[PDB]
CSV table of N, CA and C in Angstrom, one decimal:
chain,number,residue,atom,x,y,z
A,2,UNK,N,13.2,-1.6,27.8
A,2,UNK,CA,13.0,-1.7,26.3
A,2,UNK,C,11.5,-1.6,26.0
A,3,UNK,N,10.7,-0.6,26.9
A,3,UNK,CA,9.3,-0.6,26.6
A,3,UNK,C,9.1,0.8,25.8
A,4,UNK,N,8.2,1.0,24.8
A,4,UNK,CA,7.8,2.1,24.0
A,4,UNK,C,6.5,2.6,24.1
A,5,UNK,N,6.3,4.1,23.9
A,5,UNK,CA,5.2,4.8,23.9
A,5,UNK,C,4.9,5.7,22.4
A,6,UNK,N,3.7,5.5,22.1
A,6,UNK,CA,3.2,6.3,20.8
A,6,UNK,C,3.4,7.9,21.0
A,7,UNK,N,4.1,8.5,20.0
A,7,UNK,CA,4.1,9.8,20.0
A,7,UNK,C,3.0,10.8,19.2
A,8,UNK,N,2.6,9.9,18.3
A,8,UNK,CA,1.4,10.4,17.3
A,8,UNK,C,0.2,9.4,17.1
A,9,UNK,N,-0.6,9.6,16.8
A,9,UNK,CA,-1.8,8.6,16.4
A,9,UNK,C,-1.3,8.2,15.0
A,10,UNK,N,-1.9,6.8,14.5
A,10,UNK,CA,-1.6,6.1,13.6
A,10,UNK,C,-2.6,5.4,13.3
A,11,UNK,N,-3.1,5.7,12.1
A,11,UNK,CA,-4.4,4.7,11.6
A,11,UNK,C,-4.0,3.9,10.5
A,12,UNK,N,-4.1,2.6,10.7
A,12,UNK,CA,-3.3,1.7,9.9
A,12,UNK,C,-4.5,1.4,8.7
A,13,UNK,N,-3.9,1.0,7.6
A,13,UNK,CA,-5.0,0.7,6.2
A,13,UNK,C,-4.9,-1.0,6.4
A,14,UNK,N,-4.1,-1.6,6.4
A,14,UNK,CA,-4.0,-3.2,6.3
A,14,UNK,C,-4.1,-3.7,7.8
A,15,UNK,N,-4.6,-5.0,7.8
A,15,UNK,CA,-4.8,-5.8,9.0
A,15,UNK,C,-3.5,-6.2,9.7
A,16,UNK,N,-2.3,-6.4,8.8
A,16,UNK,CA,-1.1,-6.5,9.3
A,16,UNK,C,-0.3,-5.7,10.1
A,17,UNK,N,-0.9,-4.1,9.9
A,17,UNK,CA,-0.4,-3.2,10.9
A,17,UNK,C,-1.4,-2.8,12.0
A,18,UNK,N,-0.9,-2.1,13.0
A,18,UNK,CA,-1.2,-2.0,14.2
A,18,UNK,C,-1.8,-0.5,14.3
A,19,UNK,N,-3.2,-0.1,14.4
A,19,UNK,CA,-3.5,1.4,14.6
A,19,UNK,C,-3.3,1.7,16.2
A,20,UNK,N,-3.0,2.8,16.4
A,20,UNK,CA,-2.8,3.3,17.8
A,20,UNK,C,-2.9,4.7,18.1
A,21,UNK,N,-3.3,5.1,19.1
A,21,UNK,CA,-3.5,6.6,19.6
A,21,UNK,C,-2.1,7.2,20.4
A,22,UNK,N,-2.0,8.4,20.4
A,22,UNK,CA,-1.0,8.9,21.1
A,22,UNK,C,-1.0,8.7,22.5
A,23,UNK,N,-0.2,8.2,23.3
A,23,UNK,CA,-0.2,7.9,24.6
A,23,UNK,C,-0.7,6.4,24.5
A,24,UNK,N,-0.1,5.4,23.7
A,24,UNK,CA,-0.2,4.1,23.7
A,24,UNK,C,0.8,3.4,24.1
A,25,UNK,N,0.8,2.3,24.7
A,25,UNK,CA,2.1,1.7,25.1
A,25,UNK,C,2.3,0.3,24.3
A,26,UNK,N,3.6,-0.2,24.6
A,26,UNK,CA,3.9,-1.1,23.3
A,26,UNK,C,5.1,-2.0,23.8
A,27,UNK,N,5.0,-3.4,23.7
A,27,UNK,CA,6.0,-4.3,24.1
A,27,UNK,C,6.5,-4.5,22.5
A,28,UNK,N,7.9,-4.7,22.4
A,28,UNK,CA,8.4,-4.6,21.0
A,28,UNK,C,8.8,-6.3,20.8
A,29,UNK,N,8.1,-6.8,19.8
A,29,UNK,CA,8.4,-8.1,19.8
A,29,UNK,C,9.5,-8.4,18.6
A,30,UNK,N,9.6,-7.7,17.7
A,30,UNK,CA,10.8,-7.8,16.6
A,30,UNK,C,11.4,-6.2,16.3
A,31,UNK,N,12.8,-6.1,16.2
A,31,UNK,CA,13.2,-5.1,15.7
A,31,UNK,C,14.3,-5.5,14.4
A,32,UNK,N,14.3,-6.8,14.1
A,32,UNK,CA,15.4,-7.2,13.3
A,32,UNK,C,15.1,-7.0,11.8
A,33,UNK,N,13.9,-6.7,11.5
A,33,UNK,CA,13.6,-6.8,9.9
A,33,UNK,C,13.3,-5.3,9.6
A,34,UNK,N,13.9,-4.4,10.2
A,34,UNK,CA,13.8,-3.1,9.6
A,34,UNK,C,13.4,-2.1,10.6
A,35,UNK,N,12.8,-1.0,9.8
A,35,UNK,CA,12.2,0.1,10.7
A,35,UNK,C,10.7,-0.1,11.1
A,36,UNK,N,9.7,-1.3,10.4
A,36,UNK,CA,8.6,-1.5,10.9
A,36,UNK,C,8.8,-2.6,11.9
A,37,UNK,N,8.3,-2.2,13.2
A,37,UNK,CA,8.5,-3.4,14.2
A,37,UNK,C,7.2,-4.0,14.4
A,38,UNK,N,7.4,-5.4,14.8
A,38,UNK,CA,6.2,-6.1,15.3
A,38,UNK,C,6.1,-5.8,16.8
A,39,UNK,N,5.1,-5.1,17.4
A,39,UNK,CA,4.7,-4.8,18.7
A,39,UNK,C,3.4,-5.3,19.2
A,40,UNK,N,3.3,-5.4,20.3
A,40,UNK,CA,2.2,-5.7,21.3
A,40,UNK,C,1.5,-4.5,21.8
A,41,UNK,N,0.3,-4.1,21.6
A,41,UNK,CA,-0.3,-3.0,22.4
A,41,UNK,C,-0.7,-3.5,23.8
A,42,UNK,N,-0.2,-2.9,24.9
A,42,UNK,CA,-0.4,-3.2,26.3
A,42,UNK,C,-1.6,-2.8,26.8
A,43,UNK,N,-2.6,-2.0,26.0
A,43,UNK,CA,-3.8,-1.5,26.0
A,43,UNK,C,-4.9,-2.4,25.3
A,44,UNK,N,-4.6,-3.1,24.4
A,44,UNK,CA,-5.6,-4.1,23.7
A,44,UNK,C,-5.1,-5.5,23.8
A,45,UNK,N,-3.6,-5.6,23.8
A,45,UNK,CA,-2.9,-6.8,23.7
A,45,UNK,C,-2.8,-7.4,22.3
A,46,UNK,N,-3.3,-6.6,21.4
A,46,UNK,CA,-3.2,-7.1,19.9
A,46,UNK,C,-2.0,-6.7,19.4
A,47,UNK,N,-1.5,-7.7,18.6
A,47,UNK,CA,-0.2,-7.7,17.9
A,47,UNK,C,-0.3,-7.0,16.6
A,48,UNK,N,1.1,-6.3,15.9
A,48,UNK,CA,0.8,-5.9,14.6
A,48,UNK,C,2.1,-5.1,14.3
A,49,UNK,N,2.4,-4.5,13.0
A,49,UNK,CA,3.4,-3.8,12.7
A,49,UNK,C,3.2,-2.4,13.0
A,50,UNK,N,4.2,-1.6,13.4
A,50,UNK,CA,4.2,-0.3,13.3
A,50,UNK,C,5.3,0.4,12.9
A,51,UNK,N,5.2,1.6,12.7
A,51,UNK,CA,6.2,2.5,12.1
A,51,UNK,C,7.2,3.1,13.3
A,52,UNK,N,8.6,2.4,13.4
A,52,UNK,CA,9.4,2.7,14.5
A,52,UNK,C,9.6,4.2,15.0
A,53,UNK,N,9.5,5.1,13.8
A,53,UNK,CA,9.8,6.5,14.2
A,53,UNK,C,8.6,7.1,15.0
A,54,UNK,N,7.3,6.4,15.1
A,54,UNK,CA,6.2,6.9,15.7
A,54,UNK,C,6.3,6.7,17.1
A,55,UNK,N,7.3,6.0,17.7
A,55,UNK,CA,7.4,5.6,19.0
A,55,UNK,C,8.6,6.0,19.8
A,56,UNK,N,8.6,6.1,21.1
A,56,UNK,CA,10.1,6.5,21.7
A,56,UNK,C,10.1,5.7,23.0
A,57,UNK,N,11.4,5.3,23.4
A,57,UNK,CA,11.6,4.7,24.8
A,57,UNK,C,10.8,5.5,25.9
A,58,UNK,N,10.9,4.8,27.0
A,58,UNK,CA,10.2,5.5,28.2
A,58,UNK,C,11.2,5.8,29.2
B,14,UNK,N,-2.2,16.1,3.6
B,14,UNK,CA,-1.5,14.8,4.1
B,14,UNK,C,-0.3,15.6,5.1
B,15,UNK,N,-1.0,15.7,6.4
B,15,UNK,CA,0.0,16.2,7.5
B,15,UNK,C,0.3,15.3,8.6
B,16,UNK,N,0.6,14.1,8.6
B,16,UNK,CA,1.0,13.2,9.6
B,16,UNK,C,2.3,12.6,9.0
B,17,UNK,N,3.2,12.6,10.2
B,17,UNK,CA,4.7,12.5,10.0
B,17,UNK,C,5.2,11.2,9.0
B,18,UNK,N,6.2,11.3,8.2
B,18,UNK,CA,6.3,10.2,7.5
B,18,UNK,C,6.8,8.8,8.0
B,19,UNK,N,6.2,7.8,7.5
B,19,UNK,CA,6.5,6.3,8.0
B,19,UNK,C,7.8,5.8,7.3
B,20,UNK,N,8.2,4.9,7.8
B,20,UNK,CA,9.6,4.5,7.2
B,20,UNK,C,9.4,3.6,5.9
B,21,UNK,N,10.4,3.4,5.1
B,21,UNK,CA,10.1,2.8,3.8
B,21,UNK,C,9.8,1.3,4.2
B,22,UNK,N,9.4,0.6,3.2
B,22,UNK,CA,9.1,-1.0,3.0
B,22,UNK,C,8.6,-1.4,1.7
B,23,UNK,N,9.3,-2.4,1.5
B,23,UNK,CA,8.9,-2.9,0.1
B,23,UNK,C,7.5,-3.2,-0.1
B,24,UNK,N,6.8,-3.0,-1.1
B,24,UNK,CA,5.4,-3.5,-1.9
B,24,UNK,C,5.8,-5.0,-2.1
B,25,UNK,N,4.9,-5.8,-1.2
B,25,UNK,CA,5.1,-7.1,-1.7
B,25,UNK,C,3.7,-7.7,-2.3
B,26,UNK,N,3.5,-8.8,-2.6
B,26,UNK,CA,2.2,-9.4,-3.1
B,26,UNK,C,1.2,-9.1,-2.2
B,27,UNK,N,1.4,-9.5,-0.9
B,27,UNK,CA,0.4,-9.2,-0.1
B,27,UNK,C,0.2,-8.1,0.4
B,28,UNK,N,0.9,-7.1,0.4
B,28,UNK,CA,0.6,-5.7,0.7
B,28,UNK,C,-0.3,-4.9,-0.7
B,29,UNK,N,0.2,-5.5,-1.8
B,29,UNK,CA,-0.5,-5.0,-2.8
B,29,UNK,C,-2.0,-5.5,-3.0
B,30,UNK,N,-2.1,-7.0,-2.5
B,30,UNK,CA,-3.7,-7.6,-2.4
B,30,UNK,C,-4.3,-6.7,-1.3
B,31,UNK,N,-3.7,-6.4,-0.1
B,31,UNK,CA,-4.3,-5.8,1.1
B,31,UNK,C,-4.8,-4.5,0.5
B,32,UNK,N,-3.9,-3.8,-0.3
B,32,UNK,CA,-3.9,-2.4,-0.5
B,32,UNK,C,-4.9,-2.2,-1.4
B,33,UNK,N,-5.1,-3.2,-2.4
B,33,UNK,CA,-6.2,-3.1,-3.5
B,33,UNK,C,-7.6,-3.2,-3.0
B,34,UNK,N,-7.8,-4.1,-2.1
B,34,UNK,CA,-8.8,-4.3,-1.0
B,34,UNK,C,-9.3,-3.1,-0.3
B,35,UNK,N,-8.4,-2.6,0.4
B,35,UNK,CA,-8.6,-1.5,1.3
B,35,UNK,C,-9.0,-0.3,0.3
B,36,UNK,N,-8.7,0.0,-1.0
B,36,UNK,CA,-9.2,0.9,-1.8
B,36,UNK,C,-10.4,0.8,-2.3
B,37,UNK,N,-10.7,-0.5,-2.8
B,37,UNK,CA,-12.0,-0.8,-3.4
B,37,UNK,C,-13.1,-0.5,-1.9
B,38,UNK,N,-12.7,-1.1,-0.8
B,38,UNK,CA,-13.5,-0.8,0.3
B,38,UNK,C,-13.9,0.7,0.5
B,39,UNK,N,-12.7,1.4,0.5
B,39,UNK,CA,-12.9,3.0,0.9
B,39,UNK,C,-13.7,3.3,-0.3
B,40,UNK,N,-13.6,2.9,-1.5
B,40,UNK,CA,-14.2,3.5,-2.7
B,40,UNK,C,-13.6,5.0,-3.2
B,41,UNK,N,-13.8,5.3,-4.3
B,41,UNK,CA,-13.1,6.3,-5.1
B,41,UNK,C,-12.3,6.2,-6.1
B,42,UNK,N,-11.5,5.1,-6.1
B,42,UNK,CA,-10.8,4.9,-7.1
B,42,UNK,C,-11.3,4.1,-8.1
B,43,UNK,N,-12.4,3.3,-8.1
B,43,UNK,CA,-13.2,2.7,-9.0
B,43,UNK,C,-14.0,3.8,-9.7
B,44,UNK,N,-13.8,3.7,-11.2
B,44,UNK,CA,-14.5,4.7,-12.0
B,44,UNK,C,-13.8,6.1,-11.9
B,45,UNK,N,-12.6,6.3,-11.7
B,45,UNK,CA,-12.0,7.3,-11.7
B,45,UNK,C,-10.9,7.5,-12.9
B,46,UNK,N,-11.2,8.6,-13.6
B,46,UNK,CA,-10.4,8.8,-14.9
B,46,UNK,C,-8.9,8.9,-14.6
B,47,UNK,N,-7.9,8.3,-15.4
B,47,UNK,CA,-6.6,8.3,-15.1
B,47,UNK,C,-5.7,9.3,-15.9
B,48,UNK,N,-5.2,10.3,-15.0
B,48,UNK,CA,-4.0,11.2,-15.7
B,48,UNK,C,-2.7,10.6,-14.9
B,49,UNK,N,-1.8,10.8,-15.5
B,49,UNK,CA,-0.5,10.4,-14.8
B,49,UNK,C,-0.2,11.1,-13.8
B,50,UNK,N,-0.8,12.3,-13.6
B,50,UNK,CA,-0.7,13.3,-12.5
B,50,UNK,C,-1.4,12.6,-11.4
B,51,UNK,N,-2.9,12.2,-11.7
B,51,UNK,CA,-3.3,11.4,-10.8
B,51,UNK,C,-2.8,10.2,-10.2
B,52,UNK,N,-2.0,9.4,-11.0
B,52,UNK,CA,-1.4,8.3,-10.7
B,52,UNK,C,-0.3,8.7,-9.7
B,53,UNK,N,0.5,9.9,-10.1
B,53,UNK,CA,1.6,10.2,-9.1
B,53,UNK,C,1.1,10.5,-7.9
B,54,UNK,N,0.1,11.5,-7.8
B,54,UNK,CA,-0.6,11.7,-6.5
B,54,UNK,C,-1.0,10.6,-5.4
B,55,UNK,N,-1.4,9.7,-6.2
B,55,UNK,CA,-2.0,8.6,-5.3
B,55,UNK,C,-0.5,7.9,-4.9
B,56,UNK,N,0.3,7.7,-5.8
B,56,UNK,CA,1.6,7.0,-5.4
B,56,UNK,C,2.3,7.6,-4.2
B,57,UNK,N,2.2,9.0,-4.3
B,57,UNK,CA,2.8,9.7,-3.3
B,57,UNK,C,1.9,9.7,-1.9
B,58,UNK,N,0.8,9.7,-2.1
B,58,UNK,CA,0.1,9.7,-0.8
B,58,UNK,C,0.3,8.1,-0.3
B,59,UNK,N,0.1,7.1,-0.9
B,59,UNK,CA,0.7,5.9,-0.5
B,59,UNK,C,1.7,5.7,0.2
B,60,UNK,N,2.9,6.5,-0.5
B,60,UNK,CA,4.4,6.4,0.1
B,60,UNK,C,4.4,7.3,1.3
B,61,UNK,N,3.7,8.3,1.4
B,61,UNK,CA,3.8,9.1,2.8
B,61,UNK,C,3.2,8.4,3.6
B,62,UNK,N,2.0,7.8,3.5
B,62,UNK,CA,1.2,6.9,4.6
B,62,UNK,C,1.6,5.7,4.9
B,63,UNK,N,1.9,5.1,4.1
B,63,UNK,CA,2.3,3.6,4.2
B,63,UNK,C,3.8,3.2,3.8
B,64,UNK,N,4.3,4.2,3.4
B,64,UNK,CA,5.8,3.8,3.4
B,64,UNK,C,6.4,3.0,2.2
B,65,UNK,N,5.5,2.5,1.1
B,65,UNK,CA,5.8,1.8,0.1
B,65,UNK,C,6.3,2.9,-1.0
B,66,UNK,N,7.8,2.3,-1.4
B,66,UNK,CA,8.4,3.5,-2.3
B,66,UNK,C,7.7,3.5,-3.8
B,67,UNK,N,7.2,4.7,-4.2
B,67,UNK,CA,6.4,5.0,-5.3
B,67,UNK,C,7.2,4.2,-6.6
B,68,UNK,N,7.4,3.0,-6.9
B,68,UNK,CA,7.8,2.5,-8.2
B,68,UNK,C,7.1,1.3,-8.5
B,69,UNK,N,5.9,1.1,-7.6
B,69,UNK,CA,5.1,-0.1,-7.9
B,69,UNK,C,4.0,-0.2,-8.9
B,70,UNK,N,3.6,0.9,-9.2
B,70,UNK,CA,2.3,1.0,-10.0
B,70,UNK,C,2.6,1.5,-11.2
B,71,UNK,N,3.4,0.7,-12.1
B,71,UNK,CA,3.2,0.5,-13.5
B,71,UNK,C,2.6,-0.1,-13.9
B,72,UNK,N,1.8,0.2,-15.3
B,72,UNK,CA,1.0,-0.4,-16.1
B,72,UNK,C,1.4,-0.9,-17.3
B,73,UNK,N,0.7,-1.7,-18.2
B,73,UNK,CA,1.1,-2.0,-19.6
B,73,UNK,C,1.1,-1.1,-20.5
B,74,UNK,N,1.6,-0.9,-21.6
B,74,UNK,CA,1.4,0.2,-22.5
B,74,UNK,C,0.2,0.1,-23.3
B,75,UNK,N,-0.4,1.2,-23.8
B,75,UNK,CA,-1.6,1.3,-24.7
B,75,UNK,C,-1.4,0.4,-26.1
B,76,UNK,N,-2.3,0.3,-26.9
B,76,UNK,CA,-3.9,0.7,-26.5
B,76,UNK,C,-4.7,-0.3,-25.7
B,77,UNK,N,-5.7,0.1,-25.5
B,77,UNK,CA,-6.5,-0.8,-24.7
B,77,UNK,C,-6.4,-0.8,-23.5
B,78,UNK,N,-6.8,-1.9,-22.7
B,78,UNK,CA,-6.9,-1.9,-21.4
B,78,UNK,C,-5.3,-2.0,-20.7
B,79,UNK,N,-5.1,-1.4,-19.6
B,79,UNK,CA,-3.9,-1.1,-19.0
B,79,UNK,C,-3.3,-2.2,-18.0
B,80,UNK,N,-2.4,-3.1,-18.0
B,80,UNK,CA,-2.5,-4.3,-16.9
B,80,UNK,C,-1.2,-3.7,-15.9
B,81,UNK,N,-1.3,-4.3,-14.7
B,81,UNK,CA,-0.5,-3.7,-13.6
B,81,UNK,C,0.8,-4.7,-13.6
B,82,UNK,N,2.0,-4.0,-13.5
B,82,UNK,CA,3.1,-4.7,-13.6
B,82,UNK,C,3.4,-5.7,-12.1
B,83,UNK,N,3.2,-5.0,-11.1
B,83,UNK,CA,3.2,-5.5,-9.7
B,83,UNK,C,2.1,-6.4,-9.4
B,84,UNK,N,2.6,-7.8,-9.5
B,84,UNK,CA,1.5,-8.9,-8.9
B,84,UNK,C,0.8,-8.6,-7.9
B,85,UNK,N,-0.6,-8.7,-7.7
B,85,UNK,CA,-1.2,-8.5,-6.8
B,85,UNK,C,-1.9,-7.2,-6.5
B,86,UNK,N,-1.5,-6.1,-7.2
B,86,UNK,CA,-2.2,-4.7,-7.4
B,86,UNK,C,-3.5,-5.2,-8.2
B,87,UNK,N,-4.9,-5.1,-7.7
B,87,UNK,CA,-5.9,-5.6,-8.6
B,87,UNK,C,-6.5,-4.6,-9.4
B,88,UNK,N,-5.8,-3.4,-9.5
B,88,UNK,CA,-6.4,-2.3,-10.6
B,88,UNK,C,-5.9,-2.2,-12.0
B,89,UNK,N,-6.8,-2.3,-12.9
B,89,UNK,CA,-6.1,-1.9,-14.1
B,89,UNK,C,-6.8,-0.6,-14.9
B,90,UNK,N,-6.5,-0.1,-15.9
B,90,UNK,CA,-7.1,1.1,-16.7
B,90,UNK,C,-7.8,0.7,-17.7
B,91,UNK,N,-9.0,1.0,-17.8
B,91,UNK,CA,-9.8,0.6,-18.8
B,91,UNK,C,-10.5,2.1,-19.8
B,92,UNK,N,-10.4,1.5,-20.9
B,92,UNK,CA,-10.6,2.6,-22.1
B,92,UNK,C,-12.1,3.2,-22.0
B,93,UNK,N,-12.1,4.6,-22.2
B,93,UNK,CA,-13.4,5.1,-22.1
B,93,UNK,C,-14.0,5.1,-20.9
B,124,UNK,N,-7.2,8.7,-25.9
B,124,UNK,CA,-7.4,7.6,-25.1
B,124,UNK,C,-8.0,8.2,-23.7
B,125,UNK,N,-8.9,7.6,-23.2
B,125,UNK,CA,-9.4,8.0,-21.8
B,125,UNK,C,-9.7,6.5,-21.1
B,126,UNK,N,-8.8,6.8,-19.9
B,126,UNK,CA,-8.7,5.5,-18.9
B,126,UNK,C,-9.4,5.8,-17.5
B,127,UNK,N,-9.9,4.6,-17.1
B,127,UNK,CA,-10.5,4.5,-16.0
B,127,UNK,C,-9.8,3.5,-15.0
B,128,UNK,N,-9.8,3.8,-13.8
B,128,UNK,CA,-9.1,2.9,-12.8
B,128,UNK,C,-10.4,1.9,-12.8
B,129,UNK,N,-10.4,0.3,-12.7
B,129,UNK,CA,-11.1,-0.8,-12.7
B,129,UNK,C,-10.6,-1.8,-11.8
B,130,UNK,N,-11.2,-2.1,-10.9
B,130,UNK,CA,-10.8,-3.3,-10.0
B,130,UNK,C,-11.0,-4.7,-10.7
B,131,UNK,N,-9.9,-5.3,-10.5
B,131,UNK,CA,-10.2,-6.8,-11.0
B,131,UNK,C,-9.6,-7.9,-10.1
B,132,UNK,N,-10.3,-8.6,-9.5
B,132,UNK,CA,-9.6,-9.6,-8.4
B,132,UNK,C,-8.8,-10.7,-9.4
B,133,UNK,N,-9.3,-10.9,-10.5
B,133,UNK,CA,-8.3,-11.9,-11.4
B,133,UNK,C,-7.0,-11.7,-11.3
B,134,UNK,N,-6.5,-10.4,-11.3
B,134,UNK,CA,-5.2,-9.9,-11.1
B,134,UNK,C,-4.3,-10.4,-10.0
B,135,UNK,N,-5.0,-11.2,-8.9
B,135,UNK,CA,-4.3,-11.5,-7.8
B,135,UNK,C,-4.0,-12.9,-8.0
B,136,UNK,N,-4.4,-13.5,-9.3
B,136,UNK,CA,-4.2,-15.1,-9.6
B,136,UNK,C,-3.7,-15.0,-10.8
B,137,UNK,N,-3.9,-14.2,-11.7
B,137,UNK,CA,-3.1,-14.4,-12.9
B,137,UNK,C,-2.5,-13.2,-13.4
B,138,UNK,N,-1.0,-13.2,-13.5
B,138,UNK,CA,0.0,-12.2,-13.6
B,138,UNK,C,-0.2,-11.8,-15.2
B,139,UNK,N,-1.4,-10.9,-15.4
B,139,UNK,CA,-1.7,-10.8,-16.9
B,139,UNK,C,-0.4,-9.8,-17.6
B,140,UNK,N,0.0,-9.0,-16.8
B,140,UNK,CA,1.1,-8.0,-17.3
B,140,UNK,C,2.4,-8.7,-17.7
B,141,UNK,N,2.6,-9.9,-17.0
B,141,UNK,CA,3.8,-10.6,-17.3
B,141,UNK,C,3.6,-11.8,-18.4
B,142,UNK,N,2.1,-11.9,-18.7
B,142,UNK,CA,1.8,-12.6,-19.6
B,142,UNK,C,1.7,-11.9,-21.1
B,143,UNK,N,1.2,-10.6,-21.1
B,143,UNK,CA,0.9,-9.9,-22.2
B,143,UNK,C,2.2,-9.1,-22.6
B,144,UNK,N,3.1,-8.7,-21.8
B,144,UNK,CA,4.2,-7.9,-22.0
B,144,UNK,C,5.5,-8.3,-21.1
B,145,UNK,N,5.9,-9.6,-21.5
B,145,UNK,CA,6.9,-10.0,-20.5
B,145,UNK,C,8.2,-9.4,-20.5
B,146,UNK,N,8.4,-8.6,-21.5
B,146,UNK,CA,9.4,-7.8,-21.7
B,146,UNK,C,9.9,-6.9,-20.5
B,147,UNK,N,9.0,-6.8,-19.2
B,147,UNK,CA,9.2,-6.0,-18.4
B,147,UNK,C,9.6,-6.6,-17.1
B,148,UNK,N,10.3,-7.8,-17.1
B,148,UNK,CA,10.4,-8.9,-16.1
B,148,UNK,C,11.8,-9.4,-16.2
B,149,UNK,N,12.6,-8.9,-17.2
B,149,UNK,CA,14.0,-9.4,-17.3
B,149,UNK,C,15.0,-8.4,-17.3
């Protein structure tokens, strides 16, 4: 149940997580819709990400 | 604007405040003349990049200063009709538009 970025995403607000294509994520929440709370396995930093920007491994 | 569309999400008070400050810091909106066309373009950009449905940036009718309906959006439109976008942090604490024009919240 681990995911990987398909595109780069530059966040505007601090509640969102910026990431680069080829970044790895642990999904912390999928219940609140299509923005997911996730943790960057590269920085450890948590934040919201657009689910359509990631794909299962 | 060539980055794939992010999913929809509701504009909240918090998102509106964060967004206001983000745009203030980036700069460009402060002291920009307001056309409805310019408003729409901004809304679409924010919609495409941030997923907020473009129905949150409505202001109070003229004449004079134009106040934001969405509490937390800290921009209003200032005469000299010729309008400019103008930041006002007060709008995060006082919901002016609901005070002056209560008829948009019923």
